[PDB]
């Protein structure tokens, strides 16, 4: 079996997670399409001997009808993986454009060992559309499942213009969350969006709370 049996098992979990995330992100996905066991996995994204064909895992995902009630202009999403352990500034023009034509809005790229500092500096060059970057060893486990982390939530540019109004709040007076905050990424927020942290409290069972994004 050697030490490749695992190197896959991880790429597997690491996979599931991106599904979860992208569904929580408010897109269309099934519990089954997620609870996709290991067994069935092998036989689908592998070749002959038994290794992983990442460039075959990539895919698209769309906005549940529900997420359309709240966020109208939320475009469609696209995720991708790479068989290149050391991605380069060339394979990017490939990704970047693939989306600029199809006309999407959200782009999730999952590198393995790292990306060329020559590459990354191309993401913020095609607005509106936005791109994100996650390492594999990152997505291996969904933090948001952690005992301590409580569920956050994005708020429409109205549920916010409200939250403020109803609290006589000046944008800045609101508790903040780090753009690079684990969960801030897991839900891909932007400078401005607010999250509604709803936790459990020994004072009163529940306890709303909020956090803007700096």
């Amino acid at each position: 079996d050697q030490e490749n049996e695992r190197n896959i098992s991880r790429l597997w979990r690491a996979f599931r997670t991106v599904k979860e995330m992208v569904k929580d992100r408010g897109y269309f996905i099934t519990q089954e399409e997620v609870e996709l066991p290991l067994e069935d996995f092998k036989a689908k994204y592998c070749d002959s001997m038994g290794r992983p064909q990442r460039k075959m895992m990539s895919f698209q995902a769309n906005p549940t009808e529900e997420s359309i009630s709240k966020f109208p202009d939320m475009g469609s999403l696209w995720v991708e993986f790479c068989d290149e352990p050391s991605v380069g500034v060339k394979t990017m023009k490939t990704f970047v454009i693939h989306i600029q034509e199809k006309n999407f809005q959200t782009g999730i790229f999952v590198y393995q060992n790292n990306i060329t500092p020559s590459a990354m500096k191309l993401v913020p060059s095609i607005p509106p559309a936005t791109i994100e970057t996650f390492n594999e060893a990152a997505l291996v486990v969904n933090i948001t499942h952690h005992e301590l982390v409580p569920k956050h939530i994005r708020l429409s540019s109205d549920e916010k213009r409200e939250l403020l109004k109803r609290y006589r709040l000046k944008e800045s007076q609101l508790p903040r969350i780090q753009r690079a905050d684990p969960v801030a990424l897991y839900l891909g927020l932007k400078r401005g969006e607010v999250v509604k942290i709803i936790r459990k409290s020994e004072t009163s069972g529940r306890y709303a709370s909020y956090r803007i994004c700096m």
Partner: protein
């Protein structure tokens, strides 16, 4: 910013800090030789008098409660429910 008598939101009760300042504030005024809108049943202490002026809710004052954002809500001692 000003708030209508309506759309009122604050507590319907009186913060101890509210009462105590009123009480104090009044008594001070009383001893300042100020008009006293109640029958002094023989009281000679401005506080004591104020305390009465209060348990008959005949104290001409209005607490202006300020809100973090600047706007305020005005509440009279006639209204304010004095439990404590």
């Amino acid at each position: 910013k000003a708030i209508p008598k309506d759309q009122r939101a604050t507590t319907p009760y009186m913060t101890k800090y509210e009462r105590a300042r009123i009480l104090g504030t009044r008594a001070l005024q009383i001893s300042m030789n100020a008009p006293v809108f109640v029958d002094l049943e023989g009281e000679t202490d401005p506080l004591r008098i104020a305390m009465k002026e209060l348990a008959e809710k005949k104290i001409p004052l209005v607490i202006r409660r300020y809100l973090p954002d600047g706007s305020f809500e005005d509440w009279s001692v006639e209204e304010l429910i004095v439990d404590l």
